[PDB]
C-alpha cells in the first residue's frame, strides 16, 4: 500500500509478478483538498534549474529567494521546503547572506534548517513542532532525502 | 601525527585554524588591521566557532534634538516649488459655474 | 551652531547607480536615493549604516 | 524621353476628392454591415472592404486578443501604424514573402467569416498568387540547399523559369543539390524578374574558426522589449528579413549581438558613423569572448587581424574613393568575399540613399540582411519605396508598453508659436536669395522665448540643450547670454574635452550641439530638447534624436512624466509645412502633443531685448554677415 508509487510501468523492476492493479481516483466535489504548481519562469529568464551548477551564476539562486519570501507572508501555517543535495542547500542559503536575503525571511517565520549530526536533529524538530502550535508557523529549509522526509 | 591532519599539504600549511592558542588569534588580528592592512587580510579559527573584530564599538550620547524641522523648508527651496503659469487672457475671465 | 544638526545637506540631481541615473536625495538625519520623479525611495538607509 | 515603364495608379488630388464613382458591389454589402451588430457585440466590427484595395480592421479595442489576429494580416504589406487607435491599414504588396509560413488561401477564409455574409469585392482575391515563399539554405553541400517550407504552392510555380535553362540536382521538401557552385548570380535575377521573392535562410558549413557553434554566454536572458523582437526576427530557423523597431535609449547594439548568438551566425557589423564602432564593441565584452578572440575593425585606423576573423564593425561602404583609395579598398573588397558572407547588420537606414546601398551588396556577398531602425518610412517619402534593397518593413513595437515600463523618457510634446518680429518681415518678402533664412531664425521674439524656456529649467537643474540645424545661428544665442557652444568646424582636440563636460566630469550646463556632435563620438543624452529651426534638410534625422538625447530621469519609469519637450515656431514665416508633418510621428509615439501659442509669462521676466533699441541693432548685423562663412576650403 503506497500513495507515492503510481509510475508503474518501471514496477518490474523487482521482477516479480502483479496481477491486481488498480489505481486511484478518489471522487470528491470540492477540489479545494490540493493544489499543485509548477513554477518554471518560461520566456522571462527561463534560469530556474541546477542539476549540475554550484555557485557558478546569481540568476537561479536570486529566483529562489524571491519567490519563497512572498509565500511566507501568505501560508496561514507553517512551510516545509526542500532542496535537492547538502551541496546546492548550503551554496544557496550562504548566497543570501549577502544579497540580504534570508534576513528577511528572519522576520516574520522561524528558520529551521536540518542539521548533520543525529542528535541535533531530534531536538530542532521538537522546536518546530512547539513554535507552529503555540505561536507563528515556522519555515523548514530540509533536503528531499534528508532526516524531516522519512515519516514525520 | 600533525603531518597528516592536513592530508593532501603541497605547502607547510596556509593558515587553517589553531584551536589550543585561540585568545591570542584576537590579538594578532586586532594589531594587524589598526596599523594599516584593513579590508578582509584577516582569519580566524575553523572548528569551534571562529572569531573576528577591527572596528566594532557602541556609540553612545546625548545631546540635538530642539529645532531641527525649521531647516527643511530651506533645503526643500533649492527644488522647485508646485505653481503654474502666469495665466492672463487681457479679455474675460472665468466664472467657476 | 544650534547643536541640533541643522541645515539640511546640499541635494544633488541626477546621479548614475549602475546605469541607472537616478536622483539621490541628502535630506536631514537619513539619505534616500529617490528614484526619478516619484514618492517611494529604492535605495533607503540613514546616516548609521553607512 | 524614352522612359516609360508602368506603374502610375495612384490619383486623388484637390479639395473635392470625391472617390465615390467606381465601386461596382458595394452599395448593396453596406446594409449588411448594420443588421450584424444589431445582434451580438461579437457578430460585428468586419473589414470595410474598398473598391481600392485596402480594409480597415479593428483599432478601436485591441487589448490583447485582437491584437494578435492583425499581426497576419499585416504579413503581406509594408508595415502600417499597427499600435493606434483608427484604423489598421491592410494590403497585399512586395512583403508576402518573407513573412510567415502560410499560403494566401488560408488568411481569405478568416476575412470572409468577419465581413458576416459578405465577401471583400473580389479585386483583392485573384491578386493573392503573387509572391511565395522560397529560400535557400547552406548546409552540408557546402552551397546551397534548396528547400524551404512544407507548403506546397511555394514550389509549383518556380519550375518554368531556372530549371528550364539551367540544371540543378547533380551531385549526392524535396531538396536539390549544387550547379557547380559558381551558378549563382543569374538565379538570384531570374525569380525576382517573374514575380516570386526569394529569402536566402540560415545554417552554413564553411569557414570555421572560433572553436564550435555554441561559443560561451548565460541562458539567463532578460529585457523582455529584446525577447519579443528576438522571436519576430528568428524564432524559428527561417531568415525573414526586414526591419525591427526598437526603442533608441535602451540598446539598440545590445539587440544585435544578443541576437548573434541564437543565430549562430559569423555576422558583421556596418555602422553608420564613428560612434557606432565603440557602441557594437562594449556589447562584445560583458557578454561574450569575441572581443579578445574574433574582433576586427577595418575603420577608425585599426586593422585588427585582417586575415583569422570574420566578426568586424565597419561603417557601410564609406571605404572606397576613386583612384586616392586604390589598392586600400581593393584589399578590403576581395578578402571579405571570402571569409565572410553571413548577416549585414544595418543600423539607422532612414537618410541613407539608395545609391549607397547599391555598393554595399556589391562588396559583400551576404547571404541574409538585419534592419536595426526605429523609424518608419525613410526621408519621408510615400510615392517611392526604397526599403526593398536592404529588408522592407517587419514588425514594430507597442510604443505604449515601452514608454510605460522604463524604456525612454515620457516625453510632453508642446508646440510654442512665437509671433514674428516687424522688423526682419519686411526684409524677408524683399529679397531672394538664402539670406532672408537667417532673418526669421534670428527672430528677437523667439530669442526671448528661448531665454525664458533655459531659465524655466535653470531652477529645475534639468538637462536641456537647445537644437539648432544652421551652425553660424547657435553661436550668437550663447554668447549674449554667457554659455558655452560648441559647433562644427572646431576642433577635434576641443570637443573631446567639452564632450566630457557633459556626461563623464562636467561642469557646464547648457550646450548647444547641432547635427554633428551626436552621431559622431558620443550620445548626447540629456532630458529636455528645443527645437529652433524646422524647414532643414534633415527632416528625418530629428526622429531618431528624439529617443537617444531625451532619457529618463532614471532607466526604470513607474507610471509618471517629467520630462518635456518644447518646439519654437515662428508665425507666418512659411513653416508649418514640415509643423504638421511631426504630428504624424508624434501620435505613433505614444506621446502626449498640444499646441501653446502663449506662454503667458514671458513678459514678465528678466530677460533681454526689452526695448525696441536693442532689436534694431541686430538688423545692421545679420544683414552684414556674409553668406560665404562656411568652413574653409575651396
Partial sequence: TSG????????????????????????????????????????????????????????????????????????????????????????????WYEQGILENIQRNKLLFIETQDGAETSVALEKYQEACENGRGAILLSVARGKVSEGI | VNLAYEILEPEPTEIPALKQS????????????????????????????????????????????????????????????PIWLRESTVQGAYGSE | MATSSEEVLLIVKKVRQKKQDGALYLMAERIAWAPEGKDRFTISHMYADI | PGNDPQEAVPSAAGKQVDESGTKVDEYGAKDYRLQMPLKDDHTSRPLWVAPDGHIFLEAFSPVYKYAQDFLVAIAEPVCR????????????????????????????????????????????????????????????????????????????????????????????????????????????????????????????????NPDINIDLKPTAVLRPYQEKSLRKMFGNGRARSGVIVLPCGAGKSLVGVTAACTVRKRCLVLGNSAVSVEQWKAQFKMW????????????????????????????????????????????????????????????????????????????????????????????????????????????????????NNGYIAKVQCAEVWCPMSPEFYREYVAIKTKKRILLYTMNPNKFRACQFLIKFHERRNDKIIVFADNVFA???????????????????????????NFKHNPKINTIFISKVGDTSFDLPEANVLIQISSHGGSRRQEAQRLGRVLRAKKGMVAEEYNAFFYSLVSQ????????????????????????????????????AFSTKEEQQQLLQKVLAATDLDAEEEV
Fill in chain 1, 4 to 95: 507515492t508509487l503510481s509510475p508503474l510501468d518501471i514496477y518490474p523492476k523487482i521482477l516479480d509478478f502483479h496481477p491486481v492493479t488498480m489505481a486511484t481516483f478518489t471522487m470528491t466535489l470540492a477540489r479545494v483538498c490540493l493544489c499543485p504548481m509548477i513554477i518554471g519562469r518560461g520566456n522571462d529568464q527561463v534560469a530556474i534549474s541546477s542539476k549540475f551548477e554550484t555557485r557558478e551564476d546569481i540568476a537561479v539562486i536570486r529566483n529562489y529567494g524571491n519567490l519563497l519570501l512572498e509565500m511566507s507572508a501568505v501560508v496561514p501555517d507553517g512551510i516545509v521546503a526542500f532542496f535537492t543535495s547538502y551541496q546546492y542547500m548550503e551554496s544557496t542559503v550562504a548566497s
Fill in chain 2, 22 to 81: 585561540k585568545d591570542h588569534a584576537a590579538t594578532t588580528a586586532g594589531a594587524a588591521s589598526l596599523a594599516g592592512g584593513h579590508h578582509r587580510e584577516a582569519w580566524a579559527t575553523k572548528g569551534p566557532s571562529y572569531e573576528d573584530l577591527y572596528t566594532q564599538n557602541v556609540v553612545i550620547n546625548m545631546d540635538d534634538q530642539e529645532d531641527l524641522h525649521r531647516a527643511s523648508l530651506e533645503g526643500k527651496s533649492a527644488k522647485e516649488r
Fill in chain 4, 81 to 208: 501604424p499597427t499600435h493606434v487607435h483608427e484604423y489598421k491599414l491592410t494590403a497585399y504588396s512586395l512583403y508576402a514573402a518573407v513573412s510567415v509560413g502560410l499560403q494566401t488561401s488560408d488568411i481569405t477564409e478568416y476575412l470572409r467569416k468577419l465581413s458576416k455574409t459578405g465577401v471583400p469585392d473580389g479585386i483583392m482575391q485573384f491578386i493573392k498568387l503573387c509572391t511565395v515563399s522560397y529560400g535557400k539554405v547552406k548546409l552540408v553541400l557546402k552551397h546551397n540547399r534548396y528547400f524551404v517550407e512544407s507548403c506546397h504552392p511555394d514550389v509549383i510555380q518556380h519550375l518554368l523559369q531556372d530549371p528550364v535553362i539551367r540544371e540543378c540536382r547533380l551531385r549526392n521538401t524535396v531538396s536539390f543539390e549544387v550547379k557547380q557552385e559558381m551558378i549563382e548570380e543569374l538565379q538570384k535575377r531570374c525569380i525576382h524578374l517573374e514575380y516570386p521573392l526569394l529569402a536566402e535562410y540560415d545554417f552554413r558549413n564553411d569557414s570555421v
Fill in chain 4, 288 to 403: 561574450s569572448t569575441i572581443d579578445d578572440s574574433q574582433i576586427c575593425r577595418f575603420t577608425s585606423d585599426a586593422k585588427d587581424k585582417p586575415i583569422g576573423c570574420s566578426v568586424a564593425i565597419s561603417t557601410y561602404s564609406m571605404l572606397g574613393h576613386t583612384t586616392k583609395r586604390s589598392w586600400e579598398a581593393e584589399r578590403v573588397m576581395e578578402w571579405l568575399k571570402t571569409q565572410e558572407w553571413g548577416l549585414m547588420i544595418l543600423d539607422e537606414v532612414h537618410t541613407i540613399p539608395a545609391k549607397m546601398f547599391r555598393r554595399v551588396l556589391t562588396i559583400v556577398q551576404a547571404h541574409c540582411k538585419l534592419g536595426l531602425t526605429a523609424t518608419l518610412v525613410r526621408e519621408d517619402d510615400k510615392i517611392v519605396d526604397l526599403n526593398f534593397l536592404i529588408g522592407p518593413k517587419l514588425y514594430e513595437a507597442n510604443w505604449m508598453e515601452l514608454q
Fill in chain 4, 474 to 500: 547657435l553661436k550668437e544665442y550663447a554668447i549674449r547670454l554667457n554659455k558655452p557652444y560648441i559647433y562644427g568646424p572646431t576642433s577635434q582636440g576641443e570637443r573631446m574635452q567639452i564632450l566630457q
Fill in chain 4, 572 to 607: 507666418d514665416t512659411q513653416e508649418m509645412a514640415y509643423s504638421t508633418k511631426r504630428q504624424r510621428f508624434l501620435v505613433d509615439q505614444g506621446y502626449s502633443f498640444k499646441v501653446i501659442t502663449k506662454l503667458a509669462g514671458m513678459e514678465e521676466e528678466d530677460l
